[PDB]
Design a protein around this ligand. Structure first.
Ligand SMILES: Nc1nc2c(ncn2[C@@H]2O[C@H](COP(=O)(O)OP(=O)(O)O)[C@@H](O)[C@H]2O)c(=O)[nH]1
Length: 360
C-alpha cells in the first residue's frame, strides 16, 4: 500500500542502497508496497561496483567532484532536470529515503539540493535523509564537509534525519571494506524492518503520521535502534532495552541521560512471544526517560526483534564533530601564519646580513 522511493547518493549512499537490495532479495523469498531504488553517482566506477542493483536503477551523472562540495553543487544544478526526471518516471511516492554520507563531495551536496526539489514535487511525502557521519580521524575536508552538510539538511526541512555514526560503528581495525559492510548491513537491515513495520499495520498513508511525529520532534535528528533476540532468551523487556542502549543504536545517543524526546518502538515476532500487557508495561517505563513513545506490534514468524526510532532533544556527539571541524579549519590558518611569519623573519635576518656586508 506504501509507495517507497530509496535514493542512494554518492559512494556511501550507493553501497547502502546495494545492501538494501541485497537483503530485499531474501525478504522476497520468504513472502510465500512498491519499493523503488535508484543509486545516483557522478563516478561511474562506483555504480559499476554495485552488485545487487539493476542496471536501470544505476544513474550516472556525468561530471571530477572529489570531496569538493562546491563542484558537487554545480554538478547537481547542471544535471538537476535529468536526475528529477529519472525519479518522476517511477510514479508517486508516499515515503522517500535519501541516503548519503555527509562527508564526501557528491552525496553530501546533491542530497540537500535533491530533497529541496523533492519536497516541492511530492508535497504530501515523508522525506527522510539517512546521514552517514565520518570516522573521527578522517581528514580535515571530511569533517568540514560534514559540518556544512548537516547544516543544509536541517535547513531544507526534511522530515527528520537518521544519523549513522561510522565512528561508533567502526569495526575491523584497518579493514575499511569490512567496516563499511558491517555498517551498511546494519543500516539496510534497520531500514527494511522500518518499511515492513510501516507497511504491515497500514490502512492509509496517514498511518505514516506517528513516524513523522517522532522524526520531526526535538532537534529533527534521530537514529534507529535494533535488537534481535535469541530463542534462549526471548524476553521482550530485554529486547526493548537492548535496542535503546548505545550498542543497539546507529548513533550513540544516551537514552538514560534523556537525550531522546520521542520514540517509536516496533516489536516483531511469533504471536506466542507477544504479550501485549507486558509490552505495554515496558513502554510505560520508557516515558520516564523518553517523553512520547509510540508502539507497534507486528506478527511475523520468528524470535522477537525490536526496532526503535528515536528523536533527539540533545546531540553532544554532533557538537564534538563541529568543534573538530572548527579546530581543523583553524589549524590550517595558523599553519599559514607561521609560514608568513618565518618568511618575514628570514627577510629581517637577510637585511642585517646585507647591511653587515655593505659595511665591510
Ligand atoms: N557506512 C559507510 N560509509 C562510507 C561508505 N563509503 C564511504 N563511506 C564514508 O563516506 C564518506 C565519504 O563519502 P563518499 O560517499 O565516499 O563520497 P561521495 O561519493 O563524493 O559522496 C567518508 O566518511 C567515508 O568513510 C560505505 O560504504 N559505508
Amino acid at each position: 500500500m506504501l509507495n517507497v522511493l530509496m535514493l542512494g547518493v554518492g559512494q556511501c549512499g550507493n553501497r547502502i542502497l546495494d545492501a538494501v537490495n541485497r537483503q530485499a532479495f531474501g525478504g522476497s523469498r520468504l513472502a510465500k508496497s512498491r519499493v523503488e531504488t535508484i543509486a545516483i553517482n557522478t563516478a561511474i566506477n562506483d555504480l559499476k561496483e554495485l552488485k545487487f542493483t539493476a542496471a536501470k536503477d544505476r544513474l550516472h551523472v556525468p561530471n571530477g567532484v572529489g570531496a569538493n562540495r562546491s563542484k558537487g553543487k554545480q554538478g547537481f544544478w547542471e544535471n538537476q532536470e535529468m536526475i528529477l526526471e529519472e525519479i518522476e518516471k517511477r510514479g508517486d511516492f508516499d515515503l522517500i529515503f535519501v541516503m548519503t554520507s555527509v562527508s564526501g563531495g557528491t552525496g553530501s551536496s546533491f542530497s540537500p539540493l535533491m530533497i529541496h526539489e523533492l519536497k516541492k514535487r511530492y508535497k504530501n511525502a515523508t522525506i527522510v535523509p539517512i546521514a552517514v557521519l565520518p570516522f573521527r580521524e578522517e581528514g580535515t575536508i571530511y569533517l568540514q564537509n560534514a559540518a556544512f552538510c548537516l547544516r543544509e539538511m536541517i535547513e531544507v526541512e526534511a522530515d527528520g534525519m537518521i544519523l549513522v555514526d561510522n565512528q561508533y560503528l567502526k569495526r575491523f581495525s584497518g579493514d575499511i571494506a569490512s567496516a563499511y559492510d558491517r555498517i551498511n548491513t546494519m543500516v539496510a537491515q534497520r531500514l527494511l524492518f522500518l518499511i515492513e513495520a510501516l507497511d504491515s499495520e497500514m490502512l492509509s498513508v496517514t498511518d505514516l503520521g506517528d513516524f513523522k511525529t517522532v522524526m520531526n520532534g526535538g532537534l529533527r535528528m534521530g537514529t534507529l535502534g535494533y535488537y534481535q533476540a535469541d530463542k534462549k532468551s526471548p524476553s521482550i523487556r530485554a529486547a526493548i532495552k537492548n535496542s535503546l542502549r548505545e550498542v543497539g543504536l546507529l548513533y550513540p545517543a544516551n537514552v538514560d541521560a534523556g537525550e531522546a524526546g520521542r520514540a517509536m518502538i516496533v516489536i516483531q515476532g511469533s504471536r506466542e512471544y507477544l504479550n501485549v500487557d507486558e509490552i505495554t508495561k515496558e513502554i510505560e517505563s520508557l516515558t520516564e526517560t523518553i517523553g512520547h513513545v509510540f508502539k507497534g506490534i507486528v506478527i511475523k514468524k520468528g524470535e522477537p526483534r525490536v526496532l526503535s526510532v528515536l528523536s533527539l532533544e540533545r546531540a553532544p556527539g554532533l557538537v564534538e564533530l563541529y568543534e573538530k571541524a572548527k579546530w581543523a579549519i583553524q589549524e590550517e590558518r595558523e599553519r599559514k601564519d607561521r609560514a608568513r611569519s618565518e618568511l618575514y623573519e628570514a627577510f629581517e635576518q637577510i637585511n642585517d646580513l646585507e647591511e653587515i656586508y655593505h659595511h665591510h
